[PDB]
């Protein structure tokens, strides 16, 4: 299956905001380009990159790094404030075909079709907690059943998502793959599992669910555990294949 290393970029540097809080931001002493280059060399074919400068500060400070990383764009799925077709087109020109989107799709689902018109694969970031859809701007919404939401978006062309159980990294618990499996099978969508991916058991389990779902669960995304060295590249590679 796929084992996708993930890194956040903020002001040109590899970063991480603890439990999604900007007031608690940390920077890793690792060059973003050398890091991605090493991952490509170690055999990883897909890397998850999030431009926090664009997402949080509406800043283009990370563009130069993303342009230097365009050399590996075919192996990168990029996210971070992608809310307009003009910006999606710019990233696609740089080679980023796989783009992570979320809030814009909830506001205007036709955005999905529009992205496909410029040959972008819109990967919807589905955030959940306790099995319920949990998005910053949709906390009062009547429907918060994951499968229900996805079925609605498939009518608009949705085919793949990143399913993140958002509280796992904070509660120091591992991913609950039963939910991911249910979403994959019932909504019939391709899924990359995220959140609580910090142990070999989680990788072992994901590989099993990868099989039980006949491939719908494409693999997992390793973020905090990857950058913190909790999950070594050796172990990650063992399940990459």
From Swiss-Prot:
Source organism of this protein record: Thermotoga maritima (strain ATCC 43589 / DSM 3109 / JCM 10099 / NBRC 100826 / MSB8)
Q: What is the effect of changing residue 48 to A?
A: Decrease in activity
State which Enzyme Commission number(s) the record gives.
5.3.1.16
Where does this protein chiefly localize? cytoplasm
- What is the primary gene name for this protein? hisA
Q: Which reactions fall under this protein's catalytic activity?
A: 1-(5-phospho-beta-D-ribosyl)-5-[(5-phospho-beta-D-ribosylamino)methylideneamino]imidazole-4-carboxamide = 5-[(5-phospho-1-deoxy-D-ribulos-1-ylimino)methylamino]-1-(5-phospho-beta-D-ribosyl)imidazole-4-carboxamide
State what changing residue 164 to A does. Strong decrease in activity
Which HAMAP family does the annotation name? HisA
Instruction: Tell me any Pfam family this protein matches.
Output: His_biosynth
Q: Locate the active site.
A: 8 (proton acceptor), 127 (proton donor)
The domain of life for this entry's organism is Bacteria
What's this protein's name?
1-(5-phosphoribosyl)-5-[(5-phosphoribosylamino)methylideneamino] imidazole-4-carboxamide isomerase
Q: Kindly tell me the pathway this chain contributes to.
A: Amino-acid biosynthesis; L-histidine biosynthesis; L-histidine from 5-phospho-alpha-D-ribose 1-diphosphate: step 4/9
Q: Indicate the family of this protein.
A: Belongs to the HisA/HisF family.
A GO CC annotation recorded here is: cytoplasm
Which taxonomic lineage is given here? Answer: Bacteria, Thermotogati, Thermotogota, Thermotogae, Thermotogales
Q: Name one GO biological process term.
A: L-histidine biosynthetic process
User: Annotated Gene Ontology MF terms?
Assistant: 1-(5-phosphoribosyl)-5-[(5-phosphoribosylamino)methylideneamino]imidazole-4-carboxamide isomerase activity
